[PDB]
Design a protein around this ligand. Sequence first.
Ligand code: CA
Length: 350
Amino acid sequence: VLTPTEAAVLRELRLHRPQLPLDTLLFTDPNKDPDDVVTYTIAKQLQADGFLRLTDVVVTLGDADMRSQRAQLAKGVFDRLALPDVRVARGQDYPMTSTQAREHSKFLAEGAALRAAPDAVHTDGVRAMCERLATSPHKLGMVVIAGMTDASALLAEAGDLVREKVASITIMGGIDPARLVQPDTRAYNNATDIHAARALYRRAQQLGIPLRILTKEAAYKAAVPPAFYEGIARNGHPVGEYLRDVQKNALKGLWEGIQANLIPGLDTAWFFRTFVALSFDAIWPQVTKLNLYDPLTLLAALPGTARLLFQPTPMHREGASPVEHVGHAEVVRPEKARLLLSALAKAALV
Ligand SMILES: [Ca+2]
């Protein structure tokens, strides 16, 4: 069940269903934060409503065994969302410094019990995506909400196909100051594998495939409150309880760390200014602002939802391969984006 205003926004989106669902290839790094799994959850409702069909997911971030743990978790979540036919595969190796090893090996305890068995996920990265680009009668969309090792691998291995079978590439990323458009080395997903990010941004443009880049500023504007997570956990859906528990515990850990001055450069003032001697139970209720970067990227990737919420700004040189930017100014309906994200996640968890 939805609230009156949630039910209305979902009715409104439903007027804009496409004739055919858009087949979708997703590149993702779940269980180091809530974002990717919120995206899988809203994708379930978008699939149920005929906007997309999530055919293949390739998982990155970490060494080979870590990528398999993430892929097992993704497949576990798709199973619990009754998306039984999503094909999940581990992505390929990529270069990691010692500093990256620590961050890229983050795997939140709440996801451990959600993992499908190891043999439920595939080890051959983008092979199935290649075969599917070959045999699709209609163009597919590519959505990147993680590092780009595999997305770039796909454009490289199937460069012949992608030119005629991929409609757009939408990325949670960032555009470097200097230009062809190239990736910002500071943006998290680009920094996961910066050479692959450069190869992808560059090759998409050489191949004439439209790029749409959603940046962290777009999410700030449409940040959701804790009620978003409490709403989806309310009825005991395991994916809803996972999301609320991961967000609440991540935030608890950040609060406690700052309280003890253990996170250099951050302080109580930064925490109140970002999210708003206390225990975390007295802070959780004051929080009002939680970012959903990856779900917004997915909303930006589908024309039906994009036209509802966004007015992307073109960044390419007049006449060149299109590159659009979605930042704070381009999120034109943020309260509607908030309400639509809540509507989709609650409907998905029925
Ligand atoms: Ca992500």
